Design a protein around this nucleic acid. Structure first.
Ligand code: FES
Ligand SMILES: [K+]
Ligand SMILES: [Mg+2]
Ligand SMILES: [Mg+2]
Ligand SMILES: [Mg+2]
Ligand SMILES: [Mg+2]
Ligand SMILES: [Mg+2]
Ligand SMILES: [Mg+2]
Ligand SMILES: [Mg+2]
Ligand SMILES: [Mg+2]
Lengths: 46, 86, 92, 137, 96, 99, 108, 70
RNA sequence: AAACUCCAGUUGACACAAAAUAGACUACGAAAGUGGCUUUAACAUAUCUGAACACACAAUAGCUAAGACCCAAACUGGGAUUAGAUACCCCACUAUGCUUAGCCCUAAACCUCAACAGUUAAAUCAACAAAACUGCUCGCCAGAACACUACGAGCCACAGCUUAAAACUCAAA
């Protein structure tokens, strides 16, 4: 199962062929790692 | 030095009550441990003395909490005598 | 060191007095000892060390009200040991 | 609107104004409260010195510099010389735990300046230089 | 006799108490979560008697805070003002 | 520890006394008491639980026996001749409602 | 192993940032790395003023590069990041997803 | 005892009964005890599936006219 | 008082130094020790015991070569002080504390508890310390002082370390 997951995952890896397109796509994208916790233990996403 | 100014250890004055703001700042610095750090950093404390002091303080706190718990637990019995005379 | 059992069981003088007076004033300048002590705004007049170094008498100025005097006395007596500990821990 | 104890942020726009000026434009009174001296310097928000006063520049000598009255006098002198340059509101930045920590601010207030915020910048190393040994008195 | 007691584990045993971060991943990039456990005025990390965390998660939060601070994700001397309005999870009051 | 053989078990951290053993022990104790009373022995009830001092004194007065529910002064039994008289007769049986 | 490069780049215009990202990823590949993804965390004010390459920075662009590399690559990559003038600060850490989330039963 | 398990889970689902215990009555019958007796009756008149027994017993008690707020 | 005024305050740049808070935690390591961040290596043994000397380590101090030097600081100067001052306070500044390659091999190096395995029943048990014991092994001890000494021997140690006596003396220690 791990091997098959890696096999399907490598299709989206960055290669020398798709470097520029992926760089531009990343430049036009934002990812947020921030979230907060409450006293009750509930995640509050931004 | 490399941080932005007027954010850390900063208190705003409410309705010109400068004394209240100063006392609030003193409280903040005290409970954040900064006052004791400043006063303890004036002279060098040897590592053995530092370890002995911390051990003493920790065990003093533990003992005091246990004594307080015992006194509070035994306080419930301190009421009017229900079998007065006998 | 088995703490449970432990709990269960002259020119020089003048300089020392001045140093202790300054240290005690600086201690009372903050909530370091306690917030209740800090709120009382205790002012010290002088510090006198007994000739044999057996006690340190810190003379505090009294106010006019008597209930305030009694409360300040109680708080100071309850806080004396902590102030001694702080004075020795700061290596004054 | 609830009063905010936290200072305004330069970036986040706020409505708090003092004689039409923002928080980040108010002059700063830097108080250095040493054990034997208190020094007060008023500077503009652009760091242009406007006034300076210490307990020694006000005539006090030796142990008399390290008292509350001397720091109060230095604060009054600094406040006067800063008033003569158009300063009314100030942000106080205090550094040190000397006898003049609060008396200098009192002197600034009695000299006519209005304190809008108090900041502490006492140097606290995260264990850098080794302090000197204790006095064996 | 059928009325005799029988051996079993305590069925009324209440589940062991868990910290607010139990089962959740602590990342050094999550500056918002890490900022909930530092002093607003000094940036000093709160001890477990204030945060209420368990030892494992207290250590995780401490390490994450130090990593984020040294890799330029988090301020050291104060809490980032952007997170001053986040939910309060620490048992400390300045009476401000 | 010495009470463990008489304990049926613990119910939610509360010890339960095995009443089958209590029955035999009480049978023996009551038989001994009855035989002593038949022989005109002096019986003294003793208990320091103040909630039942009045009850025990009343019971002792009713059955024509003796009670001591009060502070027990040093030497009642081991020094009886000095504290009561050279010809005092001590109890033949003592019954503890509270030990 | 699996590594994460946290990159704080100089606040530049889009073409220069694209060129710097391409150069960094190419260096990673030249050192034997297989890049999995590139996440842009945004341009933001730095937590503190950072001095790099005789320049002071108060703002920076935050990027994440997930990759797999031989253990010997990391040191080499660090050296490269020390020389890139458009990098305020680069740090390689073990990828947090590889770290196992051990489960606990609660407070004893 | 066996029924303790049932009791525990009853006390975890329907909570403590709003009705008050009367320990002076030697034959007091609580809501939980009624649930236990019905659970055992269904167990001896059917299969052994703990969740199914619980839900069925709840249905039976509600049919009889006993309120049970989860 | 000396000292500095190439001083001081704000602002900016800026370590071969030391690592607030977390830590009210009690973890890692054979011990000594180890508490800033990242990464790479990495924490022996599926019977137990087994060495003053064999084989590898040992805080602080100290010594060879080179280097760094903020701060601290044995010594060395200076300021101030009774009536032979303060050794103690103030100022300045060394060796040293740091890095590299070698020595030296000592500590209240202590949990003042030798290593493994087992028991909680006995009268528990001189005392205190730290509840009382059992099996097995190694190490060590037989009055005090002479004596952490002398001599011999070994050691990169040269009035240094390890091992370690005898005579005279006493009725105690
Ligand atoms: S109690 Fe679950 S991680 Fe803290
Ligand atoms: K020891
Ligand atoms: Mg062996
Ligand atoms: Mg041998
Ligand atoms: Mg050594
Ligand atoms: Mg050395
Ligand atoms: Mg030197
Ligand atoms: Mg051995
Ligand atoms: Mg001898
Ligand atoms: Mg020798």
């Amino acid at each position: 199962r791990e091997v098959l997951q890696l096999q399907e995952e490598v299709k989206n890896f960055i290669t020398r062929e798709n470097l520029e397109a992926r760089v531009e796509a990343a430049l036009d994208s934002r990812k947020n790692y921030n979230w907060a916790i409450t006293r009750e233990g509930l995640v509050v996403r931004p | 030095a490399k941080h932005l100014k007027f954010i850390a250890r900063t208190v705003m004055v409410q309705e010109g009550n400068v004394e209240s703001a100063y006392r609030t700042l003193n409280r903040i610095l005290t409970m954040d441990g900064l006052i004791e750090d400043i006063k303890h950093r004036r002279y060098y404390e040897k590592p053995c003395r530092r370890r002995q002091r911390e051990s003493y303080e920790r065990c003093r706190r533990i003992y005091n909490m246990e004594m307080a718990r015992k006194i509070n637990f035994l306080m419930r019995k301190n009421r009017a005598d229900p079998w007065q005379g006998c | 060191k088995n703490w449970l059992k432990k709990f269960a069981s002259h020119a020089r003088l003048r300089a020392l007095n001045g140093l202790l007076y300054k240290a005690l004033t600086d201690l009372l300048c903050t909530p370091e000892v306690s917030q209740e002590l800090y709120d009382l705004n205790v002012e010290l007049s002088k510090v006198s060390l007994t000739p044999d170094f057996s006690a340190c008498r810190a003379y505090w100025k009294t106010t006019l009200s008597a209930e305030q005097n009694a409360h300040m006395e109680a708080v100071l007596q309850r806080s004396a040991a902590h102030m001694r500990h702080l004075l020795m821990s700061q290596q004054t | 609107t609830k009063f905010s104890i936290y200072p305004p942020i330069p970036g986040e726009e706020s409505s708090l104004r003092w004689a039409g000026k923002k928080f980040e434009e108010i002059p700063i009174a830097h108080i250095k409260a040493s054990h034997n001296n208190t020094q007060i310097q008023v500077v503009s928000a652009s760091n242009e010195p406007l006034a300076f006063a210490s307990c020694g520049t006000e005539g006090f000598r030796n142990a008399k510099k390290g008292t509350g009255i001397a720091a109060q006098t230095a604060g009054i002198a600094a406040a006067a010389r800063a008033k003569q340059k158009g300063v009314i509101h100030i942000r106080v930045v205090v550094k040190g735990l000397g006898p003049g920590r609060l008396s200098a601010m009192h002197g600034l207030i009695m000299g006519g300046l209005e304190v809008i915020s108090i900041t502490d910048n006492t140097p606290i190393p995260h264990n850098g230089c080794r302090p000197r040994k204790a006095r064996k008195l | 006799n059928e009325d005799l007691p029988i051996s079993m584990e305590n069925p009324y045993k209440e589940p062991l108490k868990k910290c607010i971060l139990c089962g959740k991943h602590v990342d050094y990039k999550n500056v918002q979560l890490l900022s909930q456990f530092v002093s607003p005025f000094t940036g000093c990390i709160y001890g477990r008697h204030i945060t209420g965390l368990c030892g494992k998660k207290q250590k995780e939060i401490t390490k994450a805070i130090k990593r984020a601070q040294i890799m330029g994700f988090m301020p050291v001397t104060y809490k980032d003002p952007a997170y001053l309005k986040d939910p309060k999870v620490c048992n400390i009051r300045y009476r401000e | 520890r010495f009470m463990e053989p008489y304990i049926f078990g613990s119910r939610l951290d509360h010890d339960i006394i095995d009443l089958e053993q209590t029955a035999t022990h009480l049978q023996l104790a009551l038989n001994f008491t009855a035989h002593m009373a038949y022989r005109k022995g002096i019986i003294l009830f003793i208990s320091r639980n103040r909630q039942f001092s009045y009850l025990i004194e009343n019971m002792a007065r009713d059955c024509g026996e003796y009670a001591h529910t009060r502070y027990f002064r040093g030497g009642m039994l081991t020094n009886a001749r000095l504290l009561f008289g050279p010809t005092v007769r001590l109890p033949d049986l003592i019954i503890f409602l509270h030990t | 192993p699996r590594y994460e490069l946290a990159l704080i780049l100089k606040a530049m215009q889009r073409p220069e940032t694209a060129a710097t990202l391409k150069r960094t990823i190419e260096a990673l590949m030249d050192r034997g790395a297989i890049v999995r993804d590139l996440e842009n965390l945004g341009e933001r004010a730095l937590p503190y003023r950072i001095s790099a390459h005789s320049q002071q920075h108060n703002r920076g662009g935050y990027f994440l590069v997930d990759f797999y590399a031989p253990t010997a690559a990391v040191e080499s990559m660090v050296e490269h990041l020390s020389r890139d003038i458009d990098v305020i600060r680069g740090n390689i850490v073990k990828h947090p997803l590889t770290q196992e989330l051990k489960e606990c039963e609660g407070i004893v | 005892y066996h029924e303790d398990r049932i009791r525990a889970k009853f006390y975890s689902v329907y909570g403590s009964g709003q009705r008050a215990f009367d320990l002076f009555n030697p034959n007091f019958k609580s809501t939980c005890q009624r649930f236990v007796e019905k659970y055992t009756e269904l167990q001896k008149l059917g299969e052994t599936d703990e969740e199914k027994l619980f839900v069925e017993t709840g249905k039976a008690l509600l049919a009889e006219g006993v309120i049970l707020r989860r």
